[PDB]
Amino acid sequence: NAMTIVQAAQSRYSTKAFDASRKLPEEKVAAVKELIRMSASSVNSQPWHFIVASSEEGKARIAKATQGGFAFNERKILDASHVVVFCAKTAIDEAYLLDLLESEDKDGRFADVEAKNGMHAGRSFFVNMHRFDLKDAHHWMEKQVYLNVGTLLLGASAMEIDAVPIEGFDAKVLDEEFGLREKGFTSVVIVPLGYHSEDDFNAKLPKSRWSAETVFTEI
Template sequence: MNIVQNAKTRYSTKAFNPTKKLSEEHVQAVKDLIRMSPSSVNSQPWHFIVASTEEGKERIAKATQGGFEFNTRKILDASHVVVFAAKTSIDEQYLLELLESETQAGRFDNEESKQGMHGGRSFFVNMHRFDLKDANHWMEKQVYLNVGTLLLGASSLGLDAVPIEGFNAKVLDEEFGLREQGYTSAVIVPLGYRSEDDFNAALPKSRWDESQVFTEC
């Protein structure tokens, strides 16, 4: 199955089979997909919680109480659950640490190219920090790029998944001390294998017609 077919056949899983678990190879592949996701100017403003134990999933599911109970079973029955968290601030120290990470990876041939990268990235980051004043929104956009990478990648691995925004971020942040670490939860993605009772698996996909969503010139 090619990647286009994966896009056509993947769907948001509404019920997982709690008896089927991801292999270690699939778990590592999921981590690789997440870590290698693109982000604007390679900013990588994120952190992830990966829960595979019943205790870990129950901690995440606490955030579905009080109005989002329809998502509880998805989290508890999935094999693994990933919490996507976005940074709450981005500063010069972070940019320098990121630059050093890239240096260690061998991305720069010389000091000039290194400083060129730092200057270019700082321009865009500071534009969002000081001029547009939307740095938090901008960083969350990068997290959503990552979610898209995981959803399509998971489908290519034969895994089922669903992105969840229906949860109490304050509860989840407090459960894992995310805000104290400089992050806030944005999306929860349970992964595993669909249940035979998943009504959404048999429904046809529905998308706008090409004529409505494309302008070709």
């Protein structure tokens, strides 16, 4: 309820060190996957793909992208239980929209073939606007993926799962490591999940945010 959600938002923090001996149970792993798969997205575009690494070898592959100037994020990836790599589509076309329309049809979203056509016209409008008017389709799809990351950070907290969102990685190295670009995807945020180690210095520091008077305008 309100107590538990405000508590989950205040108690979560960006874990800097995970307990390498503790692993997430299948029940929490399955809840994490369902949560991100069910995420909302503009016109239900779901322009994403997720790599979920639980093996030591799989996490080592992801950690190749956190070397040199990004080495400070390496241990978070290697010591965590599960590492989720959020990927966004690099482009979107008519063929993707029709696949999406068909999956919605098979899920019983439309009463008539007319309501199906309506959803397609409405979606094609927002999509073509971003592709050709604002010319920011790739950034717009990345925004949907960040919204999803948001659901996972709060959701993980509510399940007593420690997490840390990571942008400090070489996306070119990570993309090449999983052939994402060739598949029409690019990595944008890495989120390791697990349990913080007691030595994690960031777990004892207070959370800092702008004051309410600064970020809100009530009318």
